[PDB]
Amino acid sequence: QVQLQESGPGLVKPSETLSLTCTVSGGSISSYYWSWIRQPPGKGLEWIGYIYYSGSTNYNPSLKSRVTISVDTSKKQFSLKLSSVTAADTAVYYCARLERDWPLDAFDIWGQGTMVTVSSASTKGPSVFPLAPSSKSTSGGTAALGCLVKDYFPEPVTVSWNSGALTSGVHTFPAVLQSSGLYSLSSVVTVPSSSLGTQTYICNVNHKPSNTKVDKKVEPKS
Amino acid sequence: QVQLQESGPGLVKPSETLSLTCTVSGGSISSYYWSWIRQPPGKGLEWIGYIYYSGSTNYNPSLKSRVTISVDTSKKQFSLKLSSVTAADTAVYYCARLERDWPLDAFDIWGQGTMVTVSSASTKGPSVFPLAPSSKSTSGGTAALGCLVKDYFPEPVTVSWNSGALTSGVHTFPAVLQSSGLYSLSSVVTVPSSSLGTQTYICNVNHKPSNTKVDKKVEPKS
Amino acid sequence: FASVYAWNRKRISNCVADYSVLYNSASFSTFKCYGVSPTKLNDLCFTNVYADSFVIRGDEVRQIAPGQTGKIADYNYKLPDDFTGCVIAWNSNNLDSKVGGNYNYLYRLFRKSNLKPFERDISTEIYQAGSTPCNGVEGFNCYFPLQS
Amino acid sequence: YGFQPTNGVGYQPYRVVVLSFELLHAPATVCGPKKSTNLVKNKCVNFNFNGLTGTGVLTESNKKFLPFQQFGRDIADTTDAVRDPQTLEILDITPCSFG
Amino acid sequence: QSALTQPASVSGSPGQSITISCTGTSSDVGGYNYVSWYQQHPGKAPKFMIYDVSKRPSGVSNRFSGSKSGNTASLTISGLQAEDEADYYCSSYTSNNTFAFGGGTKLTVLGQPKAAPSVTLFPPSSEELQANKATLVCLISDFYPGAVTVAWKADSSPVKAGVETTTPSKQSNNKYAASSYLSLTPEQWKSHRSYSCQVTHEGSTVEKTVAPT
Ligand SMILES: *[C@@H]1O[C@H](CO)[C@@H](O[C@@H]2O[C@H](CO)[C@@H](O)[C@H](O)[C@H]2NC(C)=O)[C@H](O)[C@H]1NC(C)=O
C-alpha cells in the first residue's frame, strides 16, 4: 500500500550542496524511522542517518560533518542535504523506511532511487529520430521498429510508447557512453506485421534533469 | 451540470402558430424563471416573456398579443407558441434560464437555439455524394477527402464522421444558397495519407427538419 | 426607514408588549416566527427584545431567515442559526419609490468574508478583487463596495 | 539480546515490573497506610480510635480490661472507655459539657 | 564507517540447494542477531527478505532459510529456480549505533541453453541525414552466452572509425542484448552502396547488410 518516491535534481558541478526529498504516498509519517541509502554504480550499498519524526538524529560518522537530514511532518517530507560533494558521491539514492515497534529492523519499502551525477558539462537535450521498419525489417507476420535518442548529459532518461500503451515486444537497450561524453540509446518494438498499415505509434522520451519531453510518431517507410 | 435543450420543428409557411419546448436536463424546475430569446440572422438579440413556475406571466409588449408561454412542471417543459408568424420572425431561438434568489439577474445557461425558418417551399431531402482523394489529393504523408450534401430546404443540417469518431482535420464549410433556393454544402477531412488503404470512414448527414439520416462510406479511388 | 447595509437597532426594554396587534393586523405580507409560534407570544416573558429595521427588494425577503445565502444574508445582515424571534415584512412601494429613481437606498455587494450573525459593517474601503493593490482609487479589480 | 554498553537508547536493557491488583471474592487484604496523630487529654475533642468515632473529653483510667478487649460499654450501651492501640492504656470518655 | 564481508558470484544447478555466506566481526554479527537479507534484481530496488537471521515475512517463498553459527550468518535457497539470478546483500546492527551492508553476491543458476544471436540493422533516419549526420545502428538480443563481438563493415570492408559498443547485459528472460553504433558523415552514408554488421558468437558468425535506399 504505502509507497515512497524520490525527488530533487542532480547534475551540479563539484563542491556544492545537493538536496532530495522522499514524499510519502500511503501516509505513515510520525511513527517509524526513515533513512537514506546510497549506492555507487556497480558496487555495494551504504548507509546514512535517519530521523525519527518528533526528535531526530544523523549517523554514519564516515559521512558525518557533511550531511543533514530534516523532516517536515505536515506535508510528509524528508530533506537530505549533503554539502561540498566530491564526484565520488555519484550514485543512486534510495529512501527506505525502517522498522521498529514489531522489531523486524533491517529496512522495508524502498523508493526506486535517483541517479545523481556530479560533474561539469551541464545538461544537454536529446535529439530524437525514428527507426522505420521495412520489407527486410519484417519477419513474415512480424516486424520491428524503433526510436533513437542521442547526445544527452542527463544519463537517466526514460522512454514510453504511446503513453505507455504497449508492453508487448518493447525493449530498451542500455545507453552507450560515446567518446564525446554524451549518451545515446535506442528503443524498439516488435509486433505482428499486419497492423503496420492501419495503426499508429508514438515513442515518448522524458528527460527529467532537463525539461525535455518529446513524443514522436513512427511511420512505415515509403 | 444543468443544461437546456430545444425541440420543435420549423418550416411552416407564413401566418400560422409555431411551438417549441426547452426540456430541462439537470433538473431545476420550480425555482427559477425561464425565458425565451430570439435572434434574427446577423442582428442583435431580443427578448420575450418568462414564466416563474407556480404563477406565470408574459412580456415584451412589442410581441404582446401574439405570444403565449406555458409550463409543465411534471416533465419539465416550457411551451412557447407564437401565432400568425410573418417570415420576419425567421431566427434562432434560445431558451436561457434567468436568475433570482442570489440577485445576479441577466440570464444564464442557454440552449443552442433552433433555426426556425418561415416560408413556402416545403422541406426537401438532401442528396449525398462522396469526394474521394487521389494521388493529386494527397500531400505526401497527408491526404484529404470529403462529402458533398446537396439541395435541401432544411437549412440547419448537421454532419458527423464515423458516428463522431474523428475530430482531427475535420472541417465543415458554410452552406451556399443556390439560385434555385436550395442549399448545399461540403465536409472534408485531412489525415495521414498512409491509413488510406487500410482504414474506413463514413460521413453521417442528419437532417432534423425532414427525417433524412444518411450515412455514406468514403473509399479510395480506383 | 434605514438602509440595508447599516440597519437600525432599537432595544425594546421593560414594557407591556402586545404582539396581537401585530399578529392580526393583516397589513403584513410576511410574518414568520421561528423560535416560537406567534399566538403564544402574548403569554411569555423574556429579558430583552431587539428590533432591527431596514429596506430591501421584494424578492430578497427570503434571505432574512436562519441559514440562507445571497448578497443580503452573506454580507449585509446575517441571522444566527438558532434564531428565536420573528420576521415581519410589508410592501412599501408608495413611500420609498419615486419617479426618476430613488437612489438613496444602498446595499453592500462586496466583502472579504461573510458576516458573523448580527454583525454590522459600515466601512467604505475600496474593495480589491484581483491581486493588484488598489491604493484607494477605482479601476479594474478595484471596486467601490456599495450599490444603490 | 546481545546487550552492549555502547548501544543507542532503545537498544539498552530496561527492567520492567507489572503490578496487577486483583479482587477475587475474599473478605479483605492489603491496603494503603493510615497516618495518625497525638492523643490529647482533658479537652473536648473529636476522636477516632481505629474505627471508633466519637466526641468528648479523654481521661486517664484506672479500670483493667482483659488483654483482648478494645473498648468498654455502659448499661444502656454507650462507649465509655477505650484502649489506645499504640501504648495500650485505658482511657475514659466523658461527654463535654451541655446544659 | 568500514564494511562487512561476502563472497563474489556463486554457481549452482536448478532443483538443487545452495548456501551463501556473510561473515563479520564478533562485534556486529557475533554480538547481535538482528541480521536481515535483501534481494535485488538488476536495475531495480532491493526487496526485503527476512529479519532476525530467519523469519520470511508473509509474502516470500518458503524455499529460503537463514541461519547463524557465530559472527557468520548464511542464507540457503532450495530448488534453485531460474528467476533467482540476482544480487543478495546482508545487513546488521553494528555497534556505535549504526548499520552496515555486505558486498553483494551474484547468483548464477548455470543456464542451460546456448541461444543464438537475434541480430538487426538500422540505416540512417532521414531527419538525421538532413541534419548533416548518419549513424548505423546494430542491435542484438536473445543470445544466451554473452560473449559476442561485433565487426563494422563498409559494403563489406572492416571499418574501425566511429564504432562504439556496449557490453552485453541481462534481459528479463535471462538472455542478453547489446548494441553497436557507427557514426558517419552523410557523404559517407551516400558514399557506400551497402554496409554490413558481423556478429561472432561461439564460432557462429551472423551478418546483416543494408544499402542506402
Ligand atoms: C565504530 O567501531 C569501529 C570498531 O568496530 C571503529 O573502527 C576502527 O577499528 C579498526 C580496528 O577494528 C581500526 O583499524 C580503525 O583504525 C578504527 N577506526 C576508527 C575511526 O576508530 C570505528 O572508528 C567506530 N566508529 C565510531 C563512530 O565509533
| CATH number of the structural domain spanning residue B102 | 2.60.40.10
CA–CA separation, E20 vs B99, rounded Å? 79
Which of A147, A142, A144 minimizes the C-alpha distance to A131?
A: A147
- Of the candidates A1, A156, A144, A164, which has an alpha carbon nearest to the alpha carbon of residue A90? A156
**A&E contacts, CB < 8 Å:** 106
Exposed/middle/buried for residue C21 (C-beta within 10 Å: 0-12, 13-18, 19+)? exposed
Q: What is the DSSP letter of D3?
A: -
- Taking a C-beta distance cutoff of 8 angstroms, is the pair A109, A2 a contact? yes
Verify that B142 and B214 share a domain, yes or no: yes
Give the Cα separation of B3 and B108 in Å (integer): 10
**Residue B176 resides in a domain:** yes
Largest CA distance in chain D: 82
A53 and A98 part of one domain? yes
Preferred mutation among A145, A193, A196, A198 to probe B, highest tally of B CBs within 10 A: A198
The letter for the amino acid at E197 is C
What's the rounded Cα separation, in Å, for the pair E65 and E79?
A: 12
Residues A28 and A77 in one domain: yes
Cβ contact A172:A187 at 8 Å = yes
The whole-angstrom separation of Cα A114 and Cα A163 is 22
Q: Report how this structure was experimentally obtained.
A: cryo-EM
What's the CA-to-centroid distance between E23 and ligand 1, angstroms? Answer: 18
Cβ within 8 Å of residue A189, ≥6 positions away: A144, A145, A146, A161, A166, A168, A169, A170, A171, A201
Q: A17: closest CA among A67, A64, A82, A87?
A: A82
Residue whose C-alpha is closest to residue B96's, from B46, B164, B158, B140: B46
The answer to whether residues A33 and A24 touch, using CB atoms and an 8 Å cutoff, is: no
DSSP state of E212: -
Cβ atoms of E26 and E123 closer than 8 Å: no
Measured between CB atoms, which of A46, A105, A148 is closest to E101?
A46
Do D55 and D49 meet the contact criterion of CB atoms below 8 Å apart? no
Any ligand 1 atom below 6 A from CB of E27: yes
In chain E, what residues touch A178 (CB-CB under 8 Å)?
A: 164, 181, 183
In this complex, does chain D touch chain E, defined as having at least 3 beta-carbon pairs under 8 Å apart?
A: yes
- Residues from chain C contacting residue B101 (CB–CB below 8 Å): 59, 62-63, 70
Question: What DSSP assignment string belongs to chain B?
Answer: -------------SSSEEEEE---SS--TTSS--B-EEE-TTS------B--SSS-----GGGTTTEEEEEETTTTEEEEEEES--SS--BEEE------SS---S---------B---SS-----EEEEE---TTTEETTEEEEEEEEEEES----EEEETTTT--SSEEEPPPEE-TTS-EEEEEEEEEEGGGGTT--EEEEEE-SSS--EEEEEE----
Note whether B108 and B24 are same-domain residues: yes
Helix, strand and coil in chain A, % to nearest 5: 5, 35, 60
- Tell me the β-bridge partners of B213: B206
Would you say how long chain A is, in residues?
Answer: 222
Is D4 in Cβ contact with E96 (below 8 Å)? no
Residue nearest to atom 15 of ligand 1 (CA): E2
Atom of ligand 1 nearest to the CA of A61: 27
Q: Which strands form B213-218's sheet, in the order they lie side by side?
A: B158-161, B201-206, B213-218
B98 and B140 in a single domain? The answer is no
- Contact list, B103 vs chain C (CB under 8 Å): 60, 70-71
From the CB of residue D36, how many other CB atoms can be counted at a distance below 10 Å? 10
Chain mean position to CA C28: 17
Is residue D38 a contact partner of residue D48, using CB atoms and an 8 Å limit? Answer: no
Pairing outcome for strands B201-206 and B213-218: antiparallel
Is there a domain that residue B6 lies in?
A: no
Q: Does E89 touch chain A (CB under 8 A)?
A: yes
- For residue A135, the SS3 value is coil
C-alpha cell read off for A32 = 517509524
β-bridge partners, D49: D52
3-class secondary-structure state, position C120:
coil
Establish whether residue A61 lines the binding site of ligand 1, counting it when its CB lies within 6 angstroms of any ligand atom: yes
A81 shares its domain with A173: no
**What is the residue whose three cell numbers read 433556393?**
B181
* β-strand partners of C33: C86
CA–CA gap between residue E89 and residue E35 (Å, rounded)? 10
DSSP state for residue A111 in the 8-state scheme = -
The boundaries of the domain holding residue E199 are: 118-210
E96 Cα to the center of ligand 1, angstroms? 9
* E205 near A CB under 8 A: no
For chain B, the residues before each gap (C–N > 2.5 Å) are none
Identify the domain boundary among B62, B94, B116. Answer: B116
- Taking the C-alpha atoms of residue A80 and residue A19, their distance in angstroms, rounded to an integer, is 6
Ligand 1 center to A40 CA (angstroms): 23
d(CA E103, CA E2): 12
Q: Is B70 in contact with B57 (CB distance < 8 Å)?
A: no
Q: How many CB atoms lie within 10 A of CB C6?
A: 15
- To one decimal, the resolution in angstroms is 3.0
Q: Residue with C-alpha cell 549526420?
A: E133
Domain end call among B116, B146, B165: B116
Residue A5 lies inside a defined structural domain of this protein: no
C10 interfaces chain B, CB cutoff of 8 Å: no
* Lookup result for grid cell 448578497: C71
Provide φ and ψ at B167, rounded to 5°: -125, 0
Is residue A7 assigned to a domain? no
Same domain, A141 and A205: yes
Q: Return the C-alpha cell found at B106.
A: 441577466
CATH number at residue E164: 2.60.40.10
Coil/strand/helix, residue C87: strand
Instruction: Residue count of chain E, please give it.
Output: 213
Indicate the residue type of B146.
G
Contact A133, A188 (CB under 8 A): no
Half-sphere exposure of A210 (CA within 13 A, CB side): 20
**What does the alpha-carbon distance between residue E55 and residue C110 come to, in Å, rounded to a whole number?**
67
Q: Which residue of E has its CA nearest to D9?
A: E97
For chain A, the first-to-last Cα distance in angstroms comes to 49
| A121 falls within a domain | no
Name the nearest CA neighbour of B6 among B28, B26, B19, B21. Answer: B21
Q: Judge whether A178 lies within some domain.
A: yes
Do B53 and B140 have their domain in common?
A: no
> A205: closest CA among A122, A149, A154, A144?
A149
Task: Give the whole-angstrom CA distance, residue A1 versus residue B20.
Answer: 56
Query: How, if at all, do strands E107-108 and E10-11 pair?
Result: parallel
Residues B24-55 as b or e (16 or more Cβ within 10 Å = b) = beeeebeebbbbbbbeeeeeeebebbbbeeee
Residue C5, judged by CB atoms within 10 A of its CB (0-12, 13-18, 19+), counts as buried
Measured distance CA(B77)–CA(E47) in Å, rounded: 64
Tally of CB atoms within 10 A around B19: 13
Q: Is there a single domain that holds both residue B94 and residue B132?
A: no
Torsion of CA D30, D35, D41, D46, to 10 degrees: -80
Q: How many CB pairs under 8 A join B and C?
A: 11
Ligand 1: centre distance to CA C55 (Å): 87
Query: Cβ of A197 and B194 within 8 Å?
Result: yes
Task: Using alpha carbons, list the distances in angstroms from residue C83 to B89, C34, C53, C87, D30.
Answer: 54, 7, 16, 10, 60
Indicate the DSSP class of residue C40. Answer: G
**How distant is the alpha carbon of residue B113 from its chain centre?**
7
Verify that A73 and A152 share a domain, yes or no.
no
Quick one: DSSP state of residue E116?
P
CB neighbours of residue A184 within 10 Å: 23
Beta strand B142-152 with B183-192 is antiparallel
Burial class (CB in 10 A: 0-12, 13-18, 19+), A12: middle
CA–CA distances in Å: residue B36 to residues A26, B103, B107, D31, E211: 53, 20, 11, 90, 72
Is the C-beta atom of E96 inside 6 A of ligand 1?
yes
Burial of D33 (0-12, 13-18, 19+ CB in 10 A): exposed
In order of A165, B183, E142, E148, the CA distances from A219 in angstroms are 17, 41, 26, 31
Distance CA E49, CA E57 (A): 7
* Cell 437612489, residue located: C103
Calpha distance A221→B22 (Å, rounded): 54
What whole-number distance in Å separates Cα of residue C53 and Cα of residue C73?
A: 14
When CB atoms are compared, the residue of A103, A111, A148 closest to E45 is: A111
Distance from C-alpha of C127 to C-alpha of C105, rounded to nearest angstrom: 20
Contact with chain B for residue C32, Cβ under 8 A = no
Q: Are residues A181 and A99 in the same domain?
A: no
Please state the atom number of ligand 1 nearest to the C-alpha of residue D6.
28
> Which residues partner with B203 through β-bridges?
B161, B216
**CA-closest residue to ligand 1 atom 10:** E2
Rounded CA-CA distance B147/B205 in Å is 9
Does C62 contact B102 at a Cβ distance shorter than 8 Å?
no
Assess B100–C contact: CB distance below 8 Å, yes or no.
yes
The radius of gyration of chain B from alpha carbons, rounded to an integer in Å, stands at: 21
Cα B14 to Cα B89: distance, rounded to the nearest angstrom: 10
* Nearest residue, CB atoms, A104 vs list E51, E125, E166: E51
Distances (CA, A) of C99 to C54, C93, E82: 21, 11, 97
Distance CA B70, CA B79 (A): 5
Chains linked to B by 3 or more Cβ pairs within 8 Å: A, C
Q: Would you say C88 and C27 are in contact if contact means Cβ atoms under 8 Å apart?
A: no
Taking CA–CA distances from A61, the nearest residue in chain E reads E1
> Which domain does A150 fall in, by range?
127-218
Query: What would you report as the CA-atom Rg of chain C, rounded to the nearest whole angstrom?
Result: 18
Residues D6, E31: Cα–Cα separation, whole Å? 12
Structural domain total, chain A? 2
Long-range contacts of A166-174 (CB under 8 A, 24+ apart): A166/A191, A166/A201, A169/A144, A171/E141, A171/E171, A171/E177, A173/E139, A173/E166, A173/E177, A173/E178, A173/E179, A174/E166, A174/E169, A174/E177, A174/E179
A101 in a structural domain: yes
For chain C, breaks with the C atom over 2.5 A from the next N come after none
Q: Which amino acid is at A189?
A: V
With the C-alpha atoms ordered B150, B154, B156, B162, is the resulting torsion angle positive or negative? Answer: negative
**Atom 5 in ligand 1: residue holding the nearest Cα:** E27
> Shortest CA distance to A109 belongs to which of B46, E59, C7, B169?
E59
- Which is it for strands C10-12 and E10-11: parallel, antiparallel or unpaired? unpaired
Is C59 touching B (CB cutoff 8 A)?
Answer: yes
- Counting Cα atoms < 13 Å in the Cβ hemisphere of C135 gives 3
Sequence-separated contacts (24+) of A54-62 with Cβ below 8 Å: A54/A30, A59/E97, A59/E98, A60/E1, A60/E98, A61/E1, A61/E96, A61/E98, A62/E1
Q: Which of E2, E25, E94 to mutate to test the pocket of ligand 1 (most atoms within 8 A of CB)?
A: E2
Residue at grid coordinates 509486433: A191
Which residue is it, cell 539470478? Answer: E85
Q: Do A126 and A147 touch, CB atoms closer than 8 A? A: no
The protein residue whose alpha carbon is closest to atom 23 in ligand 1 is: E1
Last residue of a domain, one of B69, B86, B116: B116
Contact B147, B203 (CB under 8 A): yes
Same structural domain for residues B111 and B158?
A: no
Q: How far is CA D72 from CA A132, D38, D43, D53, E112, in A?
A: 120, 21, 20, 14, 107
